[PDB]
Design a protein around this ligand. Sequence first.
Ligand SMILES: Nc1ccn([C@@H]2O[C@H](COP(=O)(O)OP(=O)(O)OC[C@@H](O)[C@@H](O)[C@H](O)[C@@H](O)CO)[C@@H](O)[C@H]2O)c(=O)n1
Ligand SMILES: Nc1ccn([C@@H]2O[C@H](COP(=O)(O)OP(=O)(O)OC[C@@H](O)[C@@H](O)[C@H](O)[C@@H](O)CO)[C@@H](O)[C@H]2O)c(=O)n1
Ligand SMILES: [Cl-]
Ligand SMILES: [Cl-]
Ligand code: NA
Lengths: 334, 342
Amino acid sequence: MNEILKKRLKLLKNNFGTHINKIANKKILITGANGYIGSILTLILHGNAKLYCLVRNKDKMIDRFQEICGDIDKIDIYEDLYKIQDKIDIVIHCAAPTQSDFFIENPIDTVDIIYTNTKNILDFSKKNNVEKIIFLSTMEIYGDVIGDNIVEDDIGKFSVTNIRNSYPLAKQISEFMVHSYSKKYSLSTAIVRLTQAIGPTAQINDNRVYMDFIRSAIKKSQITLFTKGETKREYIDVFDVATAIIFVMCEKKMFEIYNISNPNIFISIYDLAKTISAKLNVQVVFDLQRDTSQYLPSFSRRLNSKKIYQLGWTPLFDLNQSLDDMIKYIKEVN
Amino acid sequence: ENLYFQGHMNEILKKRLKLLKNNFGTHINKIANKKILITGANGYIGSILTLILHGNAKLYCLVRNKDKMIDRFQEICGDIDKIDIYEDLYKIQDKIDIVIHCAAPTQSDFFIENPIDTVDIIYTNTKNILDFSKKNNVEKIIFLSTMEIYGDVIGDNIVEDDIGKFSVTNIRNSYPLAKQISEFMVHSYSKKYSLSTAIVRLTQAIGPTAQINDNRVYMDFIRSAIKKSQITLFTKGETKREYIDVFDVATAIIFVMCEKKMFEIYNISNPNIFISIYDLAKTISAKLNVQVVFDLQRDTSQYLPSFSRRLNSKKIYQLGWTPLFDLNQSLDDMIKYIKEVN
Ligand SMILES: Nc1ccn([C@@H]2O[C@H](COP(=O)(O)OP(=O)(O)OC[C@@H](O)[C@@H](O)[C@H](O)[C@@H](O)CO)[C@@H](O)[C@H]2O)c(=O)n1
Ligand SMILES: Nc1ccn([C@@H]2O[C@H](COP(=O)(O)OP(=O)(O)OC[C@@H](O)[C@@H](O)[C@H](O)[C@@H](O)CO)[C@@H](O)[C@H]2O)c(=O)n1
Ligand SMILES: [Cl-]
Ligand SMILES: [Cl-]
Ligand code: NA
């Protein structure tokens, strides 16, 4: 646990400590600081910068932060955006609902939360004279655009009658706002679009596919696929997402959109079940007669990631170490 | 005054309301006595709807400024006693039966000069009217939407299942994106809380009671003719769309109000009025005896790129609706009405 994390932290600081210290003593606010990516950014940066962490619930941000070996006292945790009086130089907006079920069960809320939080955070930044804001977005913004070498100018098309579009539509409008604040008020903004993050400190209560697999293998000595498992995507280790964001934080550029993916990790859902079954000594069963309306249709997509590689970033964590480090940290917690 | 003992309401508006009763009073009447909230009731379309329905029906209006709603509703010779204006939803106490959500920005310049407010006004207004329609236990909500939602989808015969795609770095997409996210919320509310909703996508309304401050191209062409003895085209004017009389928009909406259907989308267009911007400019130049000139040197960033497009309007027609007002009557009545104001 301390093993896994400490290694990585030293790996990051070995390879990139140059860049990480272009934000020494920068005043940095992270929204959703309690979530998967939020935490690890907080973890990586709080020694080397003043960190403000905006979260839904301070107490569990405290539990979570010292589970991942953090220094409670080197971060200021707010629950209310308007109590943050200090001047922020960099905002990293990471807050959003993450579960597939919530997107189809509460599509209105999904939109309202994401839309309102984006609006508020943009107000805040422009009023607080922020130097840069980074907005986490999603590969789901590409919609019907399938296949390889998808570039940040490709544009998805979205039906207003498909409930599950709650999530992309919400991130789409947020992006549009983000770019519009940049062009109206010459405020530097970046949008970063993730595939799906994996790796240590993922929680067993997550229902995104990687953890549905790990958790089914452990708790039911079985992994069940509700589809044929032909969806093919790239994955990335959460620390590789953090580092990518850091490289983007250091860039002077009034506006840019960056895909974030590890292109070496391209694999199908089925192939992902198999690897995880092998690592956890379990078998893979199908069951294709359940309701799957929270899920996306079958597709394949690779993201052109030329921009983050041009900044000098590289991914440190292949699929194996990411899975192993993820699995190990779930065992070691329960 | 009333020297011929026939009342004093505007002649153009009188005639239009009478054709409207003769042709479609069956449906207009089916809405009688029904409690009806109209948002943006001060605007071009909401006000004509209010004027049409506030005879027979009890009618609640929602507006930014009750002031200019009173002034609007009497420019168009409404009866202020028979409507109940409000600036805030949380007042409205009585059981609303039907909601017609018409409020929205309307001006191209505002979409590029205020893209964030364009989004935020439409989103918030939509969300609010939806919360309210769920609280109050409304029969049906009708959301007014735009052909701009078709975005890049161009050409003839565009259906309601088609949809556009929008770049997040084109500022001018404020409007369509706001309407898209709103359409989506309207559908999501229907599917999730069995709230009967209808979406009506409009081309561009014209006809009498168009106010002279409006900068959409029809009035750009009319206020230009009159205030400067000249009609100026800032593009080659090849854009080709369908237009519709504002009264014809209103009847279309009333027809949809009489439908009992959980969720439906309707394109609202008069396909008999399919004209280029250039030909629109010509016909308006002929009726005011002014000339048409090109100025291609201005910033046109608030304007959509040049396209040609027809909406498929079969569904509205299959209900029994027809447009009563061809291009000639709509322009003529629209010019005459502006002249009586100044
Ligand atoms: N028990 C299973 C589980 C899964 N599958 C298959 O895996 C696919 C992928 O599963 P999911 O990723 O969990 O669900 P989804 O399709 O909704 O995509 C969500 C994804 O875009 C987001 O999670 C973002 O990556 C994230 O960054 C947001 O914060 C499913 O669509 C289904 O085909 C399955 O067959 N049997
Ligand atoms: N002085 C002129 C004026 C115009 N034109 C041309 O006419 C086109 C049409 O002008 P506009 O309609 O005013 O501008 P826009 O393209 O922004 O379309 C707005 C329209 O989609 C909405 O107004 C909806 O119809 C309405 O329902 C929203 O409430 C311009 O894009 C331009 O090519 C011109 O050449 N010279
Ligand atoms: Cl959080
Ligand atoms: Cl704005
Ligand atoms: Na139709």
